[PDB]
Amino acid sequence: FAYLNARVRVRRGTLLKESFFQEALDLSFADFLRLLSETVYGGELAGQGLPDVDRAVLRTQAKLVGDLPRLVTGEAREAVRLLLLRNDLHNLQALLRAKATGRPFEEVLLLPGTLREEVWRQAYEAQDPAGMAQVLAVPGHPLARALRAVLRETQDLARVEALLAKRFFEDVAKPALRDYLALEVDAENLRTAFKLQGSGLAPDAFFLKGGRFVDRVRFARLMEGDYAVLDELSGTPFSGLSGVRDLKALERGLRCVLLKEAKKGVQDPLGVGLVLAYVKEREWEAVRLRLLARRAYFGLPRAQVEEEVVCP
Numbered sequence: 571f572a573y574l575n576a577r578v579r580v581r582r583g584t585l586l587k588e589s590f591f592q593e594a595l596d597l598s599f600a601d602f603l604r605l606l607s608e609t610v611y612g613g614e615l616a617g618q619g620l621p622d623v624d625r626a627v628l629r630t631q632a633k634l635v636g637d638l639p640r641l642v643t644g645e646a647r648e649a650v651r652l653l654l655l656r657n658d659l660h661n662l663q664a665l666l667r668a669k670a671t672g673r674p675f676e677e678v679l680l681l682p683g684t685l686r687e688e689v690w691r692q693a694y695e696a697q698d699p700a701g702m703a704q705v706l707a708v709p710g711h712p713l714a715r716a717l718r719a720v721l722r723e724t725q726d727l728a729r730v731e732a733l734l735a736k737r738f739f740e741d742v743a744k745p746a747l748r749d750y751l752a753l754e755v756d757a758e759n760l761r762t763a764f765k766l767q768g769s770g771l772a773p774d775a776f777f778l779k780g781g782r783f784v785d786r787v788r789f790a791r792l793m794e795g796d797y798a799v800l801d802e803l804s805g806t807p808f809s810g811l812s813g814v815r816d817l818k819a820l821e822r823g824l825r826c827v828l829l830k831e832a833k834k835g836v837q838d839p840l841g842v843g844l845v846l847a848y849v850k851e852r853e854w855e856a857v858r859l860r861l862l863a864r865r866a867y868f869g870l871p872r873a874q875v876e877e878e879v880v881c882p
Contacts, residue, residue: 571841574638574646578848579839581634584610585848586855591862595876599866606859610634621676623863627856628680628687635682635852638845649747649842651684653849655712656754658683659738662713663731665694665702670727679860681853685709699730712741728769732762732776739778746835746843753807753831755781757824760800760808763792764820783808807831810882826881829854854881 586609594602599620606623607615615626639651661680668678675694680687689709693702699721706714713734720733735758742751755778762776773790783806792799800811800820807830811823832850835843858879865875 571646574642574650575840575844577638577641578845582848584634585851586859591858591879594859594862595865595872595879597866599863602863602866611859620863620867624676624860625687627859631682631852631856632686635849636684638849639684646842646845650845650849652742652747652751653846654682654684656738656742657681657853658685658711658713659735661685661690662693662702662706662717663734665690666699666727666730669694679857682849682856685711699725728765729771732766735762736776736778739780743780746838746841746846749782750828750831750835750846752780752782753828755779756784756808757828759784759789760792760811761817761820761824763789764817766793768795769793822878825854825857829881 590605590609594605597605600618603615603618603623606612606626611626611630614629616622617625636654639647639654641647642650661678661683664678664680668675675691678690678694680690685706686709689705689711693705696702696705699717703714703717703721706717716734716737717730719737720730723733724730739755739758759778759781762778763773766776771793773786773793776793777786777789783803788799788802797815800808800814803809803811807827808823810826811820814820814823829850832846835845835847838844861875861879864870865872
């Protein structure tokens, strides 16, 4: 961990200050590009369009975040590799969902992971899930194996997403990181229960153990249609999910929960906590840059955007 932390410390200095996001919320697209060009992202910013901003973010994070697993070994590599693979899971699910709805690749948020954007593009270009698996296999990604396995059991979008997650977390199971991972399990159970709500499927076939606040009862209740479960979490990190009745709002709240938990890591400068915080802060950075770039580009409502780029 000493080495990984050194490499992380070397990179924390280029994290964007909160002042950047505050100013960006009210900038024209041209000025947004100007502000961005002065940050570490400037090196990869080669154009004047929205896709140029998205590309600069992806390429910059591939070199400041995505490569971390290749720099170390032992338990240190395990920790950061695990975090990035979890994002690859999110990316695959997002791609599967986009394809199922015929949404453009440009609309898919890609979190910092272990794969190059070109691989994800090839997967999106694939004719079907099976085709996506072959693409992921080239770089030897574990999702290629998980996807092939899930597909010989079901083709239903929602179930595929849930089973992919179930396999990932089961492999995960086999301090700061333990605490954080338990919250990731809680959050995954909440999104799965929401996605499979009213399906009538056996909750135990989808419940992930290893969480902390989202017990099998809370999971089953939400999956069987009780939204009130989300209003009963006031004494937990998930208190902000009260009133949530749509998947969009749920994902928003879940991101803030995990971000806050990860930031506790700064308290562990010599341990896994530092990289945990660094990776999640870069993720939040990527998410906000994407949303702020779109507000400036399209001229989106300030109030709606502000709510999506601020975490109470």
